[PDB]
Amino acid sequence: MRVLLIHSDYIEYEVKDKALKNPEPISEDMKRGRMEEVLVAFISVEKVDEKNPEEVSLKAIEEISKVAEQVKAENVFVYPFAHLSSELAKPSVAMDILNRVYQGLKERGFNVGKAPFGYYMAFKISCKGHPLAELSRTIVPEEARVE
Amino acid sequence: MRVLLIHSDYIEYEVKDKALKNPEPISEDMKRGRMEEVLVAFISVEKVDEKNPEEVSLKAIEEISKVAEQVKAENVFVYPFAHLSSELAKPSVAMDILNRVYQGLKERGFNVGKAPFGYYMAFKISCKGHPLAELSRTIVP
Ligand SMILES: Nc1ncnc2c1ncn2[C@@H]1O[C@H](CO)[C@@H](NC(=O)[C@@H](N)CO)[C@H]1O
Ligand SMILES: Nc1ncnc2c1ncn2[C@@H]1O[C@H](CO)[C@@H](NC(=O)[C@@H](N)CO)[C@H]1O
8 A cells, every 4th residue: 555645734625527437426515525734645555455455454544643643633534546556456445445544543533534436536735844744655464364 | 766747737835844954055936836737747766766867867758748748738847756765866866867857848848847856845736637637657777
């Protein structure tokens, strides 16, 4: 998994066109959204993550939470951004992992938001430009899952 | 080299704290900038690129130009974005390669801009959200 963390004044998004034949079923209101003072987690789920969705998600939750703790962010936004990596995981796995990360951050007590999966999407962001407002993290499985 | 290409309605930046002991000296007017209807090239120069700066730069110019034509972008912005890679080239080489890419794109007729090198920088961007508005490329010797 590849994650780009941008501590921003805000994030706005707008669904523009489906990118998959059968994207995530969303309501009209889910097509657009905005969150203030937010640590945006742009995430690309990679092929190697398919080995252990649970472990990778756990590590991602841990890494993202740590950064939020360092920059004092109370709001976190999970944003699908497939082209952060060149070796993408299958859609079904990507969606599952993104959901796991989203739920995990919620469990940690953060106010969490997320954009719909499977779409070409426009977005506006405003990076704060502080030393830790722009970071990258690579997270991968250490062991295959047992299920 | 790791390149993240975002076709945007605009890109704005503001130089803040230095991120290197001795960054690129700049004037007050250079601390801020904006470009519209632009293909933003977020670039991270990698350690392996140090082997052949000219080759990597040439290839980067070719690929970025290709995308610009595909999306019909007349404006291109070279944006230092170190985080895209773990194996970074040393500052002096990284800046030289970014300038080489800048010059190559400028040579081709594009309206090109670039941000100061060696700083933490605030920025505002608006991704168009078209199918080709977000792309990544890996270019190495
Ligand atoms: N491995 C992966 N990691 C993250 N997202 C992935 C994915 N595979 C498929 N997607 C989803 O399908 C859209 C088109 O690739 C993706 N859309 C996007 O990444 C938008 N930013 C495009 O504007 C995303 O919703
Ligand atoms: N290998 C490399 N590739 C691209 N840029 C590099 C670099 N090595 C050093 N820099 C410059 O120094 C700042 C801190 O790494 C970098 N700053 C940035 O990447 C800002 N976006 C941080 O907000 C950049 O100006």
